[PDB]
Every structure is written in C-alpha cells, then in structure tokens.
Amino acid sequence: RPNRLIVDEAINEDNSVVSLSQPKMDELQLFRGDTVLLKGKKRREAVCIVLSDDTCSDEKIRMNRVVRNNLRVRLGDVISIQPCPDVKYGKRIHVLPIDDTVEGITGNLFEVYLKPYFLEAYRPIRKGDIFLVRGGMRAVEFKVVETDPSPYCIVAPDTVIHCEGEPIKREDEEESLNEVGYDDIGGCRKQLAQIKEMVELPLRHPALFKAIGVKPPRGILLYGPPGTGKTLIARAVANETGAFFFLINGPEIMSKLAGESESNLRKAFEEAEKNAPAIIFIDELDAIAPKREKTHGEVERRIVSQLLTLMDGLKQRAHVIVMAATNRPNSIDPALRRFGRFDREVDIGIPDATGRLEILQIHTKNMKLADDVDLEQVANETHGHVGADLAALCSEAALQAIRKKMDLIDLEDETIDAEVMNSLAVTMDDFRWALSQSNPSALRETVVEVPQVTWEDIGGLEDVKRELQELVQYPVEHPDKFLKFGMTPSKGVLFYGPPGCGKTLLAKAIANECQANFISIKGPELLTMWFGESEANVREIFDKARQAAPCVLFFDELDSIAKARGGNIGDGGGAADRVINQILTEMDGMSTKKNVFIIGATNRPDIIDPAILRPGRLDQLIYIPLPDEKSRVAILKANLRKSPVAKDVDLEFLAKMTNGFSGADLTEICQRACKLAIRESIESEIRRERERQDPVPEIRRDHFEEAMRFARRSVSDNDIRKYEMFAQTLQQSRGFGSFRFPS
Amino acid sequence: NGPEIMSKLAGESESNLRKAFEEAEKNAPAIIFIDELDAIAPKREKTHGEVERRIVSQLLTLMDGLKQRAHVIVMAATNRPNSIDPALRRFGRFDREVDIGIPDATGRLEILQIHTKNMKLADDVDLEQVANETHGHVGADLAALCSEAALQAIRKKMDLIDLEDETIDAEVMNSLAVTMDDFRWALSQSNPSALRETVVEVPQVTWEDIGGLEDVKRELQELVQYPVEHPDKFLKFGMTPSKGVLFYGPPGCGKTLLAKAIANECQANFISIKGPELLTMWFGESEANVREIFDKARQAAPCVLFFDELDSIAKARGGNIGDGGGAADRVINQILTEMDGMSTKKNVFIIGATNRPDIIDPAILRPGRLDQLIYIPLPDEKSRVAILKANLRKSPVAKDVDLEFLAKMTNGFSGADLTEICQRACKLAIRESIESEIRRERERQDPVPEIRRDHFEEAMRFARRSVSDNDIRKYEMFAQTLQQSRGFGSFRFPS
Ligand SMILES: CN1CCC(NC(=O)OCC#Cc2c(F)cc(OCc3nnc(S[C@H]4C=CCCC4)n3-c3cccnc3)cc2F)CC1
Ligand SMILES: CN1CCC(NC(=O)OCC#Cc2c(F)cc(OCc3nnc(S[C@H]4C=CCCC4)n3-c3cccnc3)cc2F)CC1
Ligand SMILES: Nc1ncnc2c1ncn2[C@@H]1O[C@H](COP(=O)(O)OP(=O)(O)O)[C@@H](O)[C@H]1O
Ligand SMILES: Nc1ncnc2c1ncn2[C@@H]1O[C@H](COP(=O)(O)OP(=O)(O)O)[C@@H](O)[C@H]1O
Ligand SMILES: Nc1ncnc2c1ncn2[C@@H]1O[C@H](COP(=O)(O)OP(=O)(O)O)[C@@H](O)[C@H]1O
C-alpha cells in the first residue's frame, strides 16, 4: 500500500510528534498540522502529530521509542498511516501507574508528571498506549486506559483527565522502556549508523541470510576507551532482539576456576542462540583473549584458544552476532579478526565537542535542567571526557542540586514527593562544581573529531578556500570526471606559510565542510615520537585515520623535527628524520586509501625533508600568505564576531595599521582588547559594589587603543621574503610565459 | 583441521592429535591440515609451561611417523615461518615451505572475479579499477568486500520488496545489480587489517609505458634476459653473468619504472624496497630486517629486488662524519652481507637505483654485488616526446596537441617533470570541465570530453627542471669516473 512508510530514528526527544517528508505528505493526503494516525506491524494502532525535516527521505518516517514500542514496531519496519480524526476531544480520559517505573516514588505523581504533559501540550492520546514523561530525575511511563471509543483523542480544556492507582506491572508485549535504545546513544551517531546498517540485515531478518549464500557479519568488535559506551551500543542494538542477549555478557567468564569457565563459555554460546536472533557480547575481550605472546599459563591460553573454536561454530548461521568489546584492537590475540572471527572492527572512540553535547543532552533529559545551563559551553569545557564520564558529571551536578536542596526539605529518604524533585533546577553553578570534581581518567588519547569551525570563521583567504574546494571536494563529488581523464587526484596538501596565519584553521574548516573526521597531530605529538625513538607510534596514528575515514589528517608543524634539529648535522636522518621517514612510509601506504586526506602545515618549508613533497605524498603545496588589508579586515571581523563590540569601532582602519600582522597577531589584538575590556568592566563593577557597601556591556573603540600598543608582526620581512623565496623556488615557471603551441 | 587441538585441557589434546593422525590415513590418500601451526608449535624459546612444550614436541614425533609412506601429506599453515619452532622444517618434517603471500594488483582482480561470479555484477563494475584501488587487501578481505558490496545491493533493494526473509523469489535476487556505487561504498567500509607488509608482485607496467630509453632497454634485455634464455652460451664461456645492476641517474627519470618493466617482461616477482623502507631500518637500528627482505626474495624467485634510492642512508648522513659507518652504513652493510649470500641464488636479480651515485658506499659496486652500473640519462627531445606520449596514452587528449613542440620546450625535464606537466594538464582539464558541468546544473536549476591544447598552456607555467645543470654534470662526472677509458681509443692488437 502507498499509505505505508518505514520507521527510523527520531529527530527530537518529544513523543507524539512524527516527521514526514514534505514531498511525501501531500501524496499521503496529510497537511502541515494534521493528525497522523498510525497502524503498526502487530494489531496495534496509535496516533501522532505531523512534523517534517528536510533530511527525511520519502521512505522514512521518524518515531522515537515512545511511539515505536507503543506500536510494538522495531526500528526500521513498516508503519501504516491512516488519517481520520474526529472532532470529539477526549472526556474523562484515564491513566494509571501500572508500571515498575514508579518504584519508591511518593507524593502526587499525577500533579507533577501527567497534568503538565497533558494540558501544556494538548497532544493526541489513544487508549491502551504507553506514554513517557520525564521530570523529577525520573522517566515515568503510563498506559492510558480510557479515551472515549474514538480512534483518537486530543487533550483539551474540556478533557477532564483522571488518574487511579494499581500495582500491576507492564505486559510481556510491552518493552522495558527503562533500558537503553538507539536514542540513548549520542556521541557516536556515525559509528552507530555504521553498526545498525551492518547488523540490521542479520538480526531483523536472520532468515534473509539463512537462505542466500552471502556470509553475514559473524563478529563485530566494538572498541574504544573504557566508558566510551561500547556495552551501551551493543545493548541498544540488541534491544531489538533482546530474547537471550542479556545473560550472555562475558566479563566474568575468564575468572571462574579452570574448566568452570570453559564450560560456562560453552553454555553462553549454547543458550544465546536458543531463542530468536541474539547478540553475544564478549565484554572486555581484551581480558578473555589477550595476546598469547604475553601469557604465562596454559590454562588461560586454552581459555583464549577455545574462545576461537566456539567462535568458528557460529559461522553456520546468521541469527547470532558476537559483538565483542575491547579497549584497543592490537591488545587482543590476532587469532581473532580472522575471516569469520570478529571480522568487523568498529572504533567507537571518544566523543567530540558535539558528541559530548549530545551525551549531556541525553543524560540530562530527565533532570529539570533549569534555565541557565549553557550546555554548549560545558561541552567544549569537558574536552577529553569519555562517554560515561559525562554520565557521571550529569549526576555529580544533579546530586549537587539534591544535596543543596535536602537541607530545605529535611527528609531522610526520597519519600520526599516528586513535586519538589521537579523543583531541583540543576543550575549551571552545580554543573560548574561537578566539572571541577570530574576527572577524565578513562583516557585522553589522540582525538578524532568533526570540527565545528567553518568558512565564516576563516577571514580572507578567498583564493585558498577555492583552491582547496577544488582539491578536497571535487574528487569526492565528481569522481566520474577524475576517472574519465584518469587523473588520480592528489591525496595530499602542504600548507607552507608564515606561522599563525590560518593553516590549522583552514584544515579544520575543510574537514568541517566535508563533515569529515579531522585528526590533528600537532607539532609536539610528532616531536615526542622523535624524542622517544618511538616512531612506531606513527603506525598507530595513521591506523586511526584508516578507521576514522572519511578523515582529514593534519600534521601541524610538519617541520617540527627539522626545526628541532637545525637541518644541518646529525647521526640520524641528515635531511630526513625518524618520524618524518615513518610518516613517508605510512603516506605511501595510505595513498591507496581513497577516503582519507592528508594535510601538513609547515611554517618553515625550506627546512623539511624534500622527500615528503614527492608525488603521492604531500604533493600539492599551497601557500597561506600573510593577510592583506582586506583579509585583515576579514580576520578582525571573524575574531570579533563572537564578542560584543561597540558600533563605532573602525575596523577598516584597524586593518590598515596592521601592515603585516599574521592572523594570530590580529587575534591577539582582539584578545588584548577583550582583556582590557574586562579590566575596565570589573574595575567598575567592584566600584559599584563599593558604592553600595552593566557599566560597559561591550568592548569599545576606547580599549583597542591600549590593546594595540602590545602588538607585533610575528614574522619579519626577512621571513615574508623567505616564504616568497620558497614560493619562487616552488612556483616553477622558468620563462614559459607567452608560450603557445603555434597554429 | 587442527586449530582446536592446542586448546583441549592437557592430554586430551595429545590424544586427539594422535587420533587426528590415526584417522586421516585410514582411507585413501589424505591431507592433514595443521591449521595455524604458529599456535600449536611455537618457538619453545618463548614458552613458560612444560605441558605446552610437550604438545609441540609430540607434534614432531607424530610428524616423523608419517615418513614411512606417501599417501598422507601434512599441509600445515602459519602466518610466517620464523614464528614456528625450528624443530619443524627438518628433513621430513614440513620439508617444503610455500609463501602464498598477499595477492598483487592482478591477483586481487582474479579473487574479485572469483567471488563475484555468482553475483549479478551489473554493467558498470570497473573491476580493474577496484583491483588497484584495493591495494593491501589480503585474500579473504576481497571476499568480505565482495559481500559488503552485495549486501549494499540487498539492503538498498529490500526496501522495495518488504519481505522478512529471502523467501523473496530468486528472480528479484537476479535483479540485484550490484552497481559500482555499492562496491565504492564497500571499499570505503573495508579495512585491510589482516596485514600490510612488503608486497611481492608481478608489475603490470611494460616497455610501452617506458618512453624513450631505447638504449637502456636493449642494454637490460641483454643483461637480465640473455642469461636466462641462453645459459648454454654463458656456461660455454664460463662468464658467470652479473646478478646486479645500479641505475645511477637523475632522480625522477625512469629507474623504478625500468625495474618494474624488466620484471614484467620476464614475468618475475618484483620486490621494491623503497628509500623509506631502508631508511626506517637504519633509524630503528634494526638492520636485521634486511635478512627478512632478502629471504622474501629467496622464497619469491624468480624475483627482481629493487632498492629504490639505495643511497637514501648516505644522503640522510651527508657521507662525511659519523660514529657508525663512515662511508658505509648499518643497513647498506647488511645489504652487502646479504648480496654476497644471494649471489648464489641464480633466479633472483638485484637492482638498485641511486640518484646520488657519488654519495654511496663504493663497496656495493664491487663485483658480485651491484656491479653493472647503468646510466639512466635525462630524456632528449625525442625521448621527451616518447615520455609525453606514454603519460598521455591513458588519458583523452584532443587531436591537435603539438607534442613534438611540448618536447622541444622541456630542454631538460626529467621524466617525472613531464608526468607532472601531464598531471597539471589533467587537473586544469577537470577544473575547466567541472566548472562547466556545475554551470550546466545552474542552467537547468560533455562540455569538453577530453583535455586539449588550451589547458597545457596553463599547465606548463607550473613546470621545473627538477635537476640543475650542476646535477646533470654531476652525473656526467660520475659517468666519466665510471666510464673507464683512459685513451685505449684506437688500441689495436697489431697484426
Ligand atoms: C594520467 N595517467 C592516466 C591513468 C591513471 N589514472 C586513472 O585512470 O585513475 C582514475 C581515478 C580516480 C579517482 C581518484 F583518484 C580519487 C577519487 O575520489 C575518491 C575520494 N573520496 N574522498 C576523497 S577525500 C575526502 C573524503 C572526505 C573527507 C576528507 C577527504 N577522495 C579523494 C579526494 C582527493 C584525493 N584523493 C581521493 C575518485 C576517483 F575516481 C594514472 C595517470
Ligand atoms: C671467466 N671465469 C671462467 C670460469 C668461471 N665461469 C663459469 O664457468 O660459470 C658458468 C656459468 C653460468 C651461468 C650463470 F652465471 C647464470 C645463468 O643463468 C641463471 C639465471 N636465471 N634467472 C636469472 S635472472 C632473472 C630470473 C627471471 C626473473 C628475474 C631475474 N639468471 C641470471 C640472470 C642474470 C644474472 N645471473 C643469473 C646461467 C648460467 F649458465 C668464472 C669466470
Ligand atoms: N556515546 C554515549 N552515548 C550515551 N551514553 C553513553 C555513551 N558512552 C557512555 N555512555 C554512558 O556510559 C554508560 C555505559 O558504560 P559502559 O558501556 O558500561 O562502559 P563501556 O562503554 O566501557 O562498556 C551508560 O550509563 C551511558 O549512559
Ligand atoms: N585566516 C584567518 N582568519 C581568522 N582567524 C585566523 C586566521 N588565521 C589565523 N587565525 C587565528 O589564529 C589562530 C589559529 O592559528 P593557526 O592557523 O593554527 O596558525 P598555525 O596554523 O600557523 O599554527 C586562531 O585563534 C585564529 O583565530
Ligand atoms: N622514461 C620514462 N618514461 C615514461 N615515464 C617516466 C619515465 N621516467 C619517469 N617517468 C614517470 O615518472 C614516474 C616514475 O618515476 P621513477 O622512475 O620512480 O623515478 P625515480 O626512479 O628517479 O624515483 C612515473 O609516474 C612515470 O610516469
């Protein structure tokens, strides 16, 4: 039937709202705000309000867990839409707390949860349907029980809502909504999409491999630092097939004396498959099956080497998936990751500045987060916090709001009523304290990110941005033309230009335009590998890129080692280096990998191994010049955009003065102006406090006059001419001007 | 198959292993595959338990018992040979090792063609393109890829047919045209985490891709191909032909291409050890890795080793001072030590390429080692025409490009520089073609199907001679140092 679509992940946390592709709406005979009735796979029906997001395809309709398992429809299945509303808003509608969600809760939970969720929204309700409302640090779901016999009803002023109490819990047909799903993972939407695409076919349709000859993914190996959310992701995926997955987590297996483990492990495989498709999560495979190279007892060696043989047995059929988990892949015995034994590794990795924001929003979603929580600010403030840490933080703050409210309410247990738990407005002061307490001791390792900088933050460089758009973006949006001519485009760039001029910013902005996984390897990170004589770590770095593709590597200060030598003498690399040589060795390898882009930035382009400028390696050198007057205007505007500035600052003059400022120097002028602005503003707020014992709400033209006096050109003209000299060495003309193939 | 044997508690394995030998021979000739012998019989040097030592050392005694008769074969398997206890590879105990090795650019194409053979591979699958695209994919990965593509064609068709199992009919499975877009996605997903190690290959380059060098190709045909197709004449005179060459010549002039083409003409297993690969061994103070490299050649024969930038270490020293090798080096010295050993191996040919022939251990030019120095000169005008034609052969070029003039300009371009001119012409061609396809898209909101004489006019303006005349004369000076004449001109044994 054409009145059907496929359910997909929600765009918003609110329930009762369903997104439809705007082109699909009219053909579906639905309009901008109509009531979208829904008929699920089972003999189960519900209703929602229409919405639209242009990212939705005509195939997809977005429904979150509150609506999906209300139709008993797993994610990715067919939902039928049957619009036919009545005009009779519900009368005497009713609901109960017949659920385990209200364990220990006291007070009039009806007043705090149900009444605002109903009257503030005036949303459509249908009897028999479970609905989740979050607040008071609890997610409480109730099963409607009366709506009048109408197929749908909308709560309104004449809807005299009702409530009653009973002890009966949810039915077997109802999903345990207190446990995770797809919407409970925020930091790794890319890897989550990879995993769900990778295992939607075996698990949703295990027969769909049973019959055809393709061999399904028999083993997935999630990995990433502990607390990254690996077990969360596996549990979220398995909550579509949670018949027997849960009992089969295997971190305890390795620790039962001798064969008691080997027996247990067997049973773990034996019982997981016994009913429905099932996921067998080998939690902390790093411990059960470590590299045999570093074992000192045959009993543990036999444990690991009969993990493999129980793995191989599952190659016969598709309904079972062995989703392992580990801190890093090279800590496990390579006897795994064979064809059929954990064939597909997946790096969950630490969340980025926007992944942590999504994690914080996911965890806070049941807390009354107040009206001053700058989530975006803490998300950048909490760099390095791996996954579960943002979960601890979101509790450390919440508790900081309880322990500072539990003095007012002197109760000895939370038989304190839910209404005052709803009053726990967890202000940003509490989160400020919690961050000060929180420690990112899970890990802080080379971080792969989708940087949030964009062209509007790269003032000037009008030519270079075009020259990089036609270099990173043309070969990935018209590869037909690159095959038609056999070009083999350049998988490399070297930004040579004065330091502090916008090379790293350009690389981040490029990675952002393509929405690619930027991986910055700063100067100290390379120089440390050279110092420790541990150039082998480079093999790890590039490997991360090989896993993070589509990536944009970036070796900031790629000439760091050559500068830290002088480039003239040394037993070692002469002109070359340990780590630069390893970088060449790995660039040659990754020249195959079409997805990853490699960028380097050299503020000393003459002093650097010329072997890196060879074709295939960072071949396309791009000059990043000192900004000219107009580009200096652009840079000043870019840096002042994020700060309040009086409406009479003459920036076109502030650019004229800066005869040759690098971009960093103009940023430093902006920062000196800000510092002098807080000086002049603090020294008038404290003056006001003394008076009582917004002076200036913005920086002004006055403050720049003392901000500029601390200014430089961070590159002498003897360096500007050094880069011009390197350009003319690498501009490569030799009097072919006016050359023409004669007619 | 015996991968499970090592993991059954104590004697339960030792009994099982015996039964494995006992029952394999019971009917007809039978192969006994000791899967992952790396694990069952590791080097006893790195064991910490007597029971595992006894497992490995009663693998040997069950091996020996099979020397009595021929019908049973014990085909072991291992990641690498030196990880197994040398108690194996004795006479009669795994006497014959065989390196399957990673597939080459045409091996991977054959693997892909084998695995795709049941998939409706559509009409736009550039198998040859993915075969080069998928470098480093070891065997079964191309099998996973060939599934990742196929599934990418199912999961994008299973929306149309909303069935819950493949009781979907075979007819619409035949309609799963796995387009090259699906394989493009699958390659982006696929990871060659099996291994990426020094790759032995039969290169697909040939003479037609080596523009010019008409003299050098003959001089190498009579040097690598005469001693292997007329060895009667080399024994008849007792010549002991040269198992070595050093290509000294300006960098980026066609030395590695010549070596690959030579290996291809003989259909030999080329093994390139690039400059960074030697320089890495010298940095890590792990010259012992060279013993591995040459060993690969000893297993991959008929081979053509190739030490690109054989003077890499000397350049990375300056060749004047150092505690270390003075004029010599760690890794160059190890290379000499192994060249002396491999001078026995008749099948393998050893080639080196030096763009800095003066700064390199002269001990490597000794007879038996890379003795026959061959000069790889900068292309002359006709050879530049040849190089330009060779590089533009694979790309569409308008039928009015005046290549015999584009050669005249490039008074001293190396081969790499002319290839860079070709690549700049291509880059400006996509620029001018993309900027008219997007223009067409804006119009509706094949401009030029080929590069043209127009684009080379902006492609050439970014050109070099990558060697100054002070380097051309440096190589001429090294040649006259190694041309070795001293006025025996007109010398004649008088009648
Ligand atoms: C003249 N002689 C003739 C014969 C022979 N020539 C031939 O016949 O070969 C044909 C080809 C090709 C081709 C390509 F080489 C790259 C492509 O695009 C992939 C891509 N995907 N993402 C990226 S980067 C991007 C990913 C997003 C996040 C950041 C980075 N790239 C990409 C981009 C830039 C450079 N490299 C790869 C497509 C092709 F079709 C040799 C020369
Ligand atoms: C003047 N005093 C008199 C007495 C004494 N002299 C004497 O009596 O010795 C006689 C001899 C010989 C001989 C030989 F020395 C090499 C041969 O061919 C093997 C071969 N097979 N493949 C190759 S390379 C090719 C394999 C294909 C893939 C790539 C590489 N080669 C080969 C080719 C070039 C150089 N070396 C070996 C045959 C012979 F008969 C000492 C001097
Ligand atoms: N990417 C993420 N998105 C949402 N929650 C996360 C994420 N990563 C970690 N968490 C939080 O961490 C906890 C899961 O930790 P767990 O998976 O048990 O440890 P590990 O990740 O090491 O297996 C959950 O409470 C979850 O809310
Ligand atoms: N072109 C530019 N436009 C705007 N800001 C710039 C520009 N170039 C540099 N900056 C400023 O300099 C800093 C980044 O310097 P960076 O580009 O990393 O220098 P380098 O790459 O030479 O180390 C940022 O704070 C940014 O505000
Ligand atoms: N004689 C030649 N004929 C055709 N192409 C050549 C020639 N010499 C070099 N090239 C080009 O140069 C590249 C190979 O350079 P290479 O021979 O490896 O230089 P080097 O051996 O000095 O490193 C190829 O892209 C090839 O197109």
Residue numbers in the entry:
A (entry chain A): 22 to 714, 726 to 775
B (entry chain F): 270 to 714, 726 to 775
Q: What does the original paper state about this entry?
A:
Human p97 ATPase is crucial in various cellular processes, making it a target for inhibitors to treat cancers, neurological, and infectious diseases. The molecular mechanism of p97 ATPase has been extensively studied with a variety of methods, including X-ray crystallography, nuclear magnetic resonance (NMR) spectroscopy, and single-particle cryogenic electron microscopy (cryo-EM). These approaches have revealed a dynamic molecular machine with three distinct functional domains: an NTD and two ATPase domains, termed D1 and D229–31, each harboring conserved Walker A and B motifs typically associated with ATP binding and hydrolysis. A stable and functional oligomer of six p97 monomers assembles without a requirement for binding nucleotides. This homohexamer structure appears as two concentric rings, formed by the D1 and D2 domains, that create a central pore capable of binding protein and peptide substrates for segregation or degradation. The triazole inhibitors bind between the D1 and D2 domains and at the interface with an adjacent monomer.
The two-dimensional (2D) class averages of p97 | NSC799462 showed that both hexameric and dodecameric forms are present, similar to previous observations on the wild-type or mutant p9747,62,76–79. The final reconstructions reach resolutions of 3.23 Å and 3.33 Å for hexamer and dodecamer, respectively. NSC799462 binds at the interface between the D1 and D2 domains of the adjacent p97 monomers. The inhibitor does not directly interact with bound nucleotide, but its methylpiperidine group approaches the D2 nucleotide-binding site of an adjacent subunit with a distance of approximately 8 Å between the methyl group on the piperidine of NSC799462 and the 3’-hydroxyl group of the adjacent ADP ribose. The interactions between NSC799462 and p97 are primarily hydrophobic, involving surrounding residues V493, P496, V497, P500, L504, P510, I531, C535, A537, P571, and F618. K512 and N616 make hydrogen bonds with the pyridine and triazole nitrogens, respectively. In the presence of the inhibitor, a significant structural change in the loop T613-V617 is observed (inset), which allows NSC799462 to fit the binding site and enables the interaction of N616 with a triazole nitrogen. The width of the binding pocket increases to accommodate NSC799462: the distances between N616 and V497 and between K512 and P496 increase from 3.2 Å and 3.9 Å to 6.7 Å and 7.4 Å, respectively. These rearrangements expand the volume of this binding cavity, induce subtle shifts of the surrounding structural motifs, and result in the helices, α2 A, α2B, α2 C, and α2E moving outwards.
